Amino acid sequence: STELLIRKLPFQRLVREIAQDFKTDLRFQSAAIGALQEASEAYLVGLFEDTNLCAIHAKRVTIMPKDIQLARRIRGER
Amino acid sequence: GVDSLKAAIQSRQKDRQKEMDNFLAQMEAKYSK
Amino acid sequence: DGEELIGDGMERDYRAIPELDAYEAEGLALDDEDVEELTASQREAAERAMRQRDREAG
Amino acid sequence: RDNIQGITKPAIRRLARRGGVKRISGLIYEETRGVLKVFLENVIRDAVTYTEHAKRKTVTAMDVVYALKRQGRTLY
């Protein structure tokens, strides 16, 4: 069962909490939450791959927040 | 060096964008009119 | 220092929890009503609004 | 409603392992929650904007598809 990344129920409740700050009384299609979860997990896994490469370039095995920040800057995020 | 690190991440990001394009096309094929 | 991701006890991260491993009905659309796809002009109007929103945010 | 805590430490470890990471600093957990928060805020804001312009109250799979298309052009 190494297919598991973020559990579905907490992810769904996270999405709905965030959405409330933009519009009240929304419902979601099940596939809308699923697509958001797929995109979020693909984003985070890829960021961890890139972060890992940054750490390795720094001759380290332990990734640190500065590795995440460097990866995001190389990726053009911020 | 840093140039190699930069090229590898940018190359991965290009592939990831194509994977996302493909995923969104599959979503359109299933859910779009 | 850090924390080893591959080591004794890693199986504790991979338990199955049926109560959390599926979306719950609350907050989901249950009737296929009022879910019509964006028309071309509604998508364009949203994207014009978001384009102006982003430009103002800088 | 503190649902950011649903991004658990095991979930973060599962994601890091899938990315090939072997060791993490303790500050990685909060950094990851913060990165996911802004990512989700950005995509959901666009998705709900499509929903509003469709004049309905249900976020559809296609609303999210268009928000993810837009994010691919603006996030980086």
Author numbering:
A (entry chain A): 57 to 134
B (entry chain H): 212 to 244
C (entry chain C): 68 to 125
D (entry chain B): 23 to 98
Which text from the study accompanies this structure?
The αB helix also forms a steric clash with ASF1A/B (English et al., 2006; Natsume et al., 2007), which implies that the binding of DNAJC9 and ASF1A/B to H3-H4 dimer are mutually exclusive. Moreover, the residues Gly212, Val213, Leu216, Ile220, and Gln224 of αB are bound in a consecutive channel constituted of Asp106, Leu109, Cys110, and His113 in H3.3 α2 helix; Ala127, Ile130, and Arg131 in H3.3 α3 helix; as well as Tyr98 in the H4 C terminus. Notably, Arg223 and Arg227 of αB establish prominent polar interactions with Glu105 and Asp106 in H3.3 α2 helix. Furthermore, the residues Met231, Phe234, Leu235, Met238, and Tyr242 of αB are bound into another consecutive channel constituted of Ala87, Ala91, Glu94, and Ala95 of H3.3 α2 helix, as well as Ala83, Met84, Val87, Leu90, and Lys91 of H4 α3 helix. Interestingly, DNAJC9 HBD αB has a similar structural configuration to the αA helix of CENPA-specific chaperone HJURP (Hu et al., 2011), though they share no significant sequence similarity.
From biosynthesis to assembly into nucleosomes, histones are handed through a cascade of histone chaperones, which shield histones from non-specific interactions. Using structure-guided and functional proteomics, we identify and characterize a histone chaperone function of DNAJC9, a heat shock co-chaperone that promotes HSP70-mediated catalysis. With its dual functionality, DNAJC9 integrates ATP-resourced protein folding into the histone supply pathway to resolve aberrant intermediates throughout the dynamic lives of histones.
